[PDB]
Amino acid sequence: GSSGSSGVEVESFLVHPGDLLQLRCRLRDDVQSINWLRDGVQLAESNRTRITGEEVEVQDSVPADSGLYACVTSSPSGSDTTYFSVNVSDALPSGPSSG
């Protein structure tokens, strides 16, 4: 590994407990399949979470679902990978409600 800090693209994200966590996986023209991961583990869907293959959606996200998602596409020429740094927390720069 030669010197440098540029190896992969980690798409950063920010949400709160109750929002919709939507993600996207960069696919190719050769890609055949996709593998969703999270913190180094196979991702799963649920009443809230929804994996449409290359796009994930988690309704009413929470600070417990946050993490580093990684999508791996299986192609006859190799295998790409896309990371996504998510962060669910009530802490947001927007606060329309206050008194």
Curated annotation (Swiss-Prot):
Effect annotated for changing S66C: In HH2; uncertain significance
Disulfide feature: C25-C71
Residues annotated as domain Ig-like C2-type: 8-89
Expression sites by tissue: Detected in astrocytoma, neuroblastoma and adrenal cortex cell lines. Some isoforms are detected in foreskin fibroblast cell lines, however isoform 17, isoform 18 and isoform 19 are not detected in these cells.
Modification(s) after translation: Autophosphorylated. Binding of FGF family members together with heparan sulfate proteoglycan or heparin promotes receptor dimerization and autophosphorylation on tyrosine residues. Autophosphorylation occurs in trans between the two FGFR molecules present in the dimer and proceeds in a highly ordered manner. Ubiquitinated. FGFR1 is rapidly ubiquitinated by NEDD4 after autophosphorylation, leading to internalization and lysosomal degradation. CBL is recruited to activated FGFR1 via FRS2 and GRB2, and mediates ubiquitination and subsequent degradation of FGFR1.
Record localization: Cell membrane; Nucleus; Cytoplasm, Cytosol; Cytoplasmic vesicle
Glycosites: N47, N87
Similarity field: Belongs to the protein kinase superfamily. Tyr protein kinase family. Fibroblast growth factor receptor subfamily.
Disease: Pfeiffer syndrome: A syndrome characterized by the association of craniosynostosis, broad and deviated thumbs and big toes, and partial syndactyly of the fingers and toes. Three subtypes are known: mild autosomal dominant form (type 1); cloverleaf skull, elbow ankylosis, early death, sporadic (type 2); craniosynostosis, early demise, sporadic (type 3).
Function: Tyrosine-protein kinase that acts as a cell-surface receptor for fibroblast growth factors and plays an essential role in the regulation of embryonic development, cell proliferation, differentiation and migration. Required for normal mesoderm patterning and correct axial organization during embryonic development, normal skeletogenesis and normal development of the gonadotropin-releasing hormone (GnRH) neuronal system. Phosphorylates PLCG1, FRS2, GAB1 and SHB. Ligand binding leads to the activation of several signaling cascades.
Comment on protein domains: The second and third Ig-like domains directly interact with fibroblast growth factors (FGF) and heparan sulfate proteoglycans. Isoforms lacking the first Ig-like domain have higher affinity for fibroblast growth factors (FGF) and heparan sulfate proteoglycans than isoforms with all three Ig-like domains.
Summary of subunit composition and partner proteins: Monomer. Homodimer after ligand binding. Interacts predominantly with FGF1 and FGF2, but can also interact with FGF3, FGF4, FGF5, FGF6, FGF8, FGF10, FGF19, FGF21, FGF22 and FGF23 (in vitro). Ligand specificity is determined by tissue-specific expression of isoforms, and differences in the third Ig-like domain are crucial for ligand specificity. Affinity for fibroblast growth factors (FGFs) is increased by heparan sulfate glycosaminoglycans that function as coreceptors. Likewise, KLB increases the affinity for FGF19, FGF21 and FGF23.
Protein name: Fibroblast growth factor receptor 1
Gene coding for it: FGFR1
Section of the entire sequence shown: 38 to 123 of 822
